[PDB]
Amino acid sequence: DGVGSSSGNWHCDSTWLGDRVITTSTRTWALPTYNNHLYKQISNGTSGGATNDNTYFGYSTPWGYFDFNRFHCHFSPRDWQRLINNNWGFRPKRLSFKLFNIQVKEVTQNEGTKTIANNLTSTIQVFTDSEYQLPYVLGSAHQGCLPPFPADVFMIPQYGYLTLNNGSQAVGRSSFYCLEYFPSQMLRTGNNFQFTYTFEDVPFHSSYAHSQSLDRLMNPLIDQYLYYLSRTQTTGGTANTQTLGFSQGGPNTMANQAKNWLPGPCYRQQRVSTTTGQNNNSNFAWTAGTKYHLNGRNSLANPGIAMATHKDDEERFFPSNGILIFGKQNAARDNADYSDVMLTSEEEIKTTNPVATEEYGIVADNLQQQNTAPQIGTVNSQGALPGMVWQNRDVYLQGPIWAKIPHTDGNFHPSPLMGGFGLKHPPPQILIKNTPVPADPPTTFNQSKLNSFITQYSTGQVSVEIEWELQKENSKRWNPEIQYTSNYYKSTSVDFAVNTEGVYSEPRPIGTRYLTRNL
Amino acid sequence: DGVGSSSGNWHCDSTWLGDRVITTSTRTWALPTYNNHLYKQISNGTSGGATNDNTYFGYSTPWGYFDFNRFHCHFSPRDWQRLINNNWGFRPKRLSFKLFNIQVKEVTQNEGTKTIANNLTSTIQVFTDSEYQLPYVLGSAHQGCLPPFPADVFMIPQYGYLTLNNGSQAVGRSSFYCLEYFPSQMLRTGNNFQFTYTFEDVPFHSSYAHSQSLDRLMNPLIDQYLYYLSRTQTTGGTANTQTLGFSQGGPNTMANQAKNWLPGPCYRQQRVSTTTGQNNNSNFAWTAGTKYHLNGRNSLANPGIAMATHKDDEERFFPSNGILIFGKQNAARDNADYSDVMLTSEEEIKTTNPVATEEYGIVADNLQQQNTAPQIGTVNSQGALPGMVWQNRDVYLQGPIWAKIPHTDGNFHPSPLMGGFGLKHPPPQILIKNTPVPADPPTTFNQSKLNSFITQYSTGQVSVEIEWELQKENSKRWNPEIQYTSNYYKSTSVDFAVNTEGVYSEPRPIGTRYLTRNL
Amino acid sequence: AHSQSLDRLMNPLIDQYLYYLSRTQTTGGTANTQTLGFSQGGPNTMANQAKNWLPGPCYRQQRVSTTTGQNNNSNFAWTAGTKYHLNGRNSLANPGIAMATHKDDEERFFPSNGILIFGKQNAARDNADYSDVMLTSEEEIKTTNPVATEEYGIVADNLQQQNTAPQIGTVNSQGALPGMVWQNRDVYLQGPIWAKIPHTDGNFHPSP
Incomplete structure (x- = not known):
């Protein structure tokens, strides 16, 4: 472990072994100093235009964290294709994580002339929340994961969390967590960090579409x-x-x-067309949105339970907030146009799940008699019924992988609604931080905490290796199956490649359901 | 492996062992950052004056690569002389490669005052394309190989490649490769890299000229x-x-x-004289050039199949694009004058191969009869015929050594046309790159990939050792043979030595065919 | 299929x-x-x-379009067919050596007798219409093999001099040349699997 020796190599690859596939990816990262080394109470009340549905109380910390909960952090487009065109299912088994070739640098600023030099004796701190004692922030589809393209250098996300609140205030049960109250490993350049994790047993993801429908x-x-x-x-x-x-x-x-049998559960959503002219002329995204009510505040049930995006011959329709939507490269953060985003479709489950924008069915509403005509009622919300069968939402090359199942007395079909694997003990959170390095302190004692630090940031590489178990296809279907394929004719650029500017981009969302299977 | 310890020594030498000769050469190199750490789509269409024969689509990468596919990277002029004056043949057997004494430096620029300092904790990345999964760019006679003169410091070439194209556009089959998707070794100053390779079995190069002709x-x-x-x-x-x-x-x-027997195959070339006055007054280099037609575009068959450069007493003649031409020291890149280049000659094979600028022979063209005189036709293009024997193009001290045989269903006499050894599994490509080192990142999280890096380049030494097997001469020829010799009389400078300016130069091309052998 | 071409x-x-x-x-x-x-x-x-290297061998074939209006108005299937002469009788070199069916952006073109053609279910035995058959395409080998309906390349035809302009000749038939690399014809779900190599003193690239 010296200053002049690499403490790790670049491991980026994939290897297929019949029933397993092992992915390995390495990336270069940069970590700034967050919050000036401070913990800060953050809050959002009802003042100004702030609505009650968006209130909160919590803290922002000086720590950053590693996140690779996104399939494209592990599978290249070609590997994803190999996976989806030939397997009925797959799931994670185990993983390895490594931090190495750490470099801590200090930046000096004088007369606009800025200079960056190595601080060979500085340290960064790392630790895993193995006992899940910190608020689990992964699994909320946040930005900051390892980039899809290996050559891209990325910045590490800042860690923050929330606790109970009443408006912009905290309540008796609100919890405050200090990350320095956990043992953490300290590394100087030349030191490295690593750990192993084993995924709990979980069902294979259904990377197939039914070739039969419940009613046939x-x-x-x-x-x-x-x-x-x-x-x-x-x-x-x-x-x-x-x-x-x-x-x-x-x-x-x-x-x-x-x-x-009976089709799966249903919570409804308002239908909207991609042909704006067919839509009502009003702003109903929120007012007509499908929501859930929790302790006085409303949230969009987004994307909510898994339902078919649309029925036969209606590809232009979709649930206002019932599908995953990814942005195209460089799409605006706010009010991005339809042509700048990419809508996914769960059309493959029309086969067993109710269509998201229609009724579940019809039930009697009264008691018909010789003098009373029978009346019926439309069911737009239908919970679990004995005999129901259903499919979960599909996963995407650029979508989430897992989510932590909330620690509660009960739950029903704990499959993460955004898609993926629900785990009681998911991959632990990996927190990282640059150790504060005080600038020269006063020459005569003073009780106040130091607030003058040497400016610095760190950089290094990170590796994540995951072993996936495959479930091979066993179909006796005579005719060819549908497969994901690259376009055949000429084009200005190659899909899933770089620009003339060097910008990598993912042209479309790639699902997982191509091969078929009977009911 | 420390900061203060050399990680390799300067090994430059040659040792002759009866039937083997082992060459060892070391050179100092410099590697800049290429493409600003980015991959860029590059293309060339038909717009402007760009002709269809030069269209292309591909990518330029941030990586560099080592190349020593040039005989003078291993043999000194004197060693080359020892080789060619005493052996009927030779070929490569195995090689060793080593990278050491690596130094990564960062350059600061403020007020024109530029400063260069060591970045002790930076790394470079190296890896070999052992499984030949990347487009093989070696064997296309590109510049960037190790210099002939040991004392010369050289810059490492940037790696780029091409894939299918239709004009300036890509097509469905176009492939995009990311080099960070390969495992690579990361080294800091103090670390080194090395590997071994064994050449597949290949025929000895014929370093002799026939002292008999097919027709005698x-x-x-x-x-x-x-x-x-x-x-x-x-x-x-x-x-x-x-x-x-x-x-x-x-x-x-x-x-x-x-x-x-019959003389070897023939594809013809237009004849041109070094006495300009004997040439037609027009610009026919391309219009009268011998070419091959492949998917709509034309390429010069340069130098094409091996044919004698000229016949007896015609040393002034040569095939427009049927010989290797090297430039003299400092010859211009474009429109260099005849006196600035050096033409080679394959005159030694007049003995079995057709002369490049004449017909293969004559065949009947009709059926003569009592009332019809016999007619003949001239053959200017003749493919393989049972009974043919031929010689391959000679190799030169400053010419290429090997080339990768294309992976195809079939091929005929896979000897590289530019000269050398055709190998199915040639020395692997050695790719090298400076790891990106981010400058200070923003203080509040931002999803965008970092695009602000510390400026840096690397330098170090490289060693290549190759073992060559010799085939000794066994002639019973009574009279002396022709030999390569240095000039005898006085001269302004020494051939194959340096200037008064310190510039090394190679005065002429040196072939390999001096000793003779019967048919 | 190759994702690189010989000339690039x-x-x-x-x-x-x-x-x-x-x-x-x-x-x-x-x-x-x-x-x-x-x-x-x-x-x-x-x-x-x-x-x-050099592109694979070439024996040429006449080009025909699936847009009948672009074709010469005459019956040339046999008269303009690419054939081989053996002991007084002629045979179509069908499909002959493997060559790319057409070049970029020309999917409508094909060698008169240089591709495999299967019939659709119940297509007539004689004079079946274009819409009743299925033409295959060896377009995937444009990458190393010459296009079936074009020249192999150009060679010199004379000796230019101060008083004689250089002349060139078009090569429409090119046998094995040192340095050539090529691909064989593809196989099809409904195509043949093997063939017996004739018992002869010699042969060249015995791929059926």
Whole structure:
């Protein structure tokens, strides 16, 4: 461990081993000093235009953190293609993390002439929240993960967290956490850090689409032996009175046939078209948004439970806040135009899950009688019902991987709604910070805490290796399957490559469901 | 591996061991930062004056690469002389490569006063394309190899590559490669790198000239027992009619004798003289150039298949684009004058290969009859014919050594046309790069990739050792052979030495074919 | 399929150390006389650069378009067909040596008898219409093999002199040349698998 010796090598690669695939990626990072080495109470109340739905109380810390919860941090576009075109499923098994070739630099500023030099004796601090004692901030789709392109140098995100609040105030139960109250490893240039983690057992992600629908699982050539009420009134001429007629479901009455299952749960969303002219002329994104109510404040159920984005021949429609939306390279942060973002589609699950913008079904609303016509009610919100089967939201090359399952007495189908793997004990948070280096202190004692520090930042490389277990496809389907493919004809540039400017970009979102499977 | 310890020594030498010769050379190199650490899409279309024959699509990378594919990177002039004056052949067997005494420096620029200092904690990255997964750019006669003179410090070439294109656009099959997607070794000052490689089995290069020609392999004292058609018409007086006369080939009719072999293949080239006055007054270098047509675009077949540069007593003639041409020290890059370049000559193969600027031979063109005179056609393009024997192009002290044989279903006589050894698995490409070192990042998180880096370059030494197998001469020739020799009389300077200015220069191209051998 | 072409294997950022004849005549004004000028191949003159290999063999075929209106109005399938002559009788070299079906942006063109053609279900045995058959394409080999309907290249045809302008000849038939590399014809789900190599004293690249 010396000043003149590399403390790690560049490991970036992928290797396929039949039923496993191991991804390894390394990136160069930079870490500034955050908050001037201070912890600060942050808050947002109801004053000004601030609405109650956005209030909060918490703290910003001097620490940064590593995040690689994004599939493109591990899979290259080509690897993702290898994965999705040939496997019915996959999931994480274990990972390795390493920090090395650390460099702490100090920057001097005098007469606009700025100079940067090495501070060979400075240290950075690193530690993992192995016992999950800090607010788990990963799994909220935040920016700051390792870049998709290996050659890109990235800046490390600052760590902050929230606790209970009443307006802009804290309450008795509000918690304050100090990260320096954890043991942490201190490294100088020449030292390195690393750890291993094993994923808990979790279901394989379904990287397939059903080639059968719930309502079409019968034999199209045979009648049922079961009968259904088919007639309530006589038909001949005008002397029409009540009667009772029963028939057997068959090939031409599949909608009436007795079945064993029901489509998945439903919470509805308002429909919007990509052809603006077909939309109501008003600003309803929030007012007509599908939300949930929690302790006085409202939140968008975004993207909410998994539902088919649209039905047959309606690709132009989507749930106002029921799909994942990624921006194109350089899309604005606010009010970006439709042509600057990329909408995903969960159309593959029309097969078992209700369409996001329609009713779940119809139920009786009264008791019909000789003098009262039967009335029906539309169900727009439907919770778990015995017999339901459903699919979860798909995952994307540039989407999240896992999320921590909240520590609660109960939960139902703990699959993260944004997509991914729900884990009770997810990869630990890796916090990093530059140790404060005091500038010269006063020459006579003073009780006050020092607030004059040498300006500095650090840089180094980081490696993450993950082993994924694959579930091979076993189909007896005779005809070719749908596959993700690169465009065939000429183009100005190559998709998933760099600019003439050197800017890498991801042209479209790439899902995971190409191969098919029966129900 | 410390800051204060050399990590390698200067190994430059040659040792002859009967049937082997081992060359070792070390050089000092400098590596700048290329492309500002970026990958950039580069292209060339048909706009402006750009012709379709020069279109392309590809990428330039932030990486550099080591290249020693040039005989003078290993053999000193005197060693080359020892080799060519005493051996009938030679070939590479194995090699060692080493990178050491690495120094990474950072340069500060303020008020024109520039300062360079050591950055002891910086790293460079190195890796070999052992599995040949990157476009093989070596073997295209590019500049950037180790200098011939050991005392010369050189700059490392930037790596770039090409993929399919349609005009200035890419096509579906165009590939984008990221070099950071390979594992690479990271070294700080004090660390070193090295590897070993073994050349595949390959034929010895023919460092000899034939002392017999294909058409003169018979006994000049004996007749053949075989006859040939010698007369088709009577001769006496004027009553001349058709007849059939046969004769036996003999010492005075060697041109008619039955033979067993045929001269090598032929693709023709236009002839040009070094006496400009004998040349047509027009600019025909390209219009009259010998080319090949590939997917809509034309390329010069330069130098093309191996053919004798000229016939007896015509040293002033040469194929417009059928020979290797080296420049003299400091010759201009464009429109350099004849007296500034050095033309090579493959005159040694007149013996078995057709002369580059003449026909292969003559074939019948019709069916002669009592009322139709026989007609003949000139063959200017002749592919492989059973019975052909030929020699390959010679290699030069300052010429290329090997080339990678394209991975294709088929090939014919895979000897690199520019000369050298064709290898399916040639010495791997050695890529090197300076690791980006971010300047101070913003103090509050920002998603954008960093684009502000500390300016730096690296320098160090490189060693290459190659073991060559020799094929000794076994001639029973009584009279002395031709040998490469230094001039005898006085001269302003020494050939293959330095200036009064310290500039090394190679006065002429030195071939390899001096000793002779029978057919 | 190759993602690189034979004529584009160099580094697009570096010049060669090798020179080529670039000028045969002076340029300034009207007093233009013969001279000799040499230049180094580089990123903008890739067509002039010295290279190590040559495209595969070539036997030519007549070009025909799937847009009938672009075709000559005559029945040339046999008369203009590419054939081989064996003991007095002629046969179509069908499909013949492997060559790219067409060049960039010409998908409508194909060699009269230089590709495999399968019929669609129930296509007639004789005079089936274009819409009843399925043409294959060896476009993937444009990368190393000459295009089936064009020349292999150009060679000199005479000896230029002060009083004789240089002449060139087009090569439409080119046999094996040292340095050539090529790809074989592709195989198809409904195509043949193997063939017996004729028992002969010799053969060249015995790929069916």
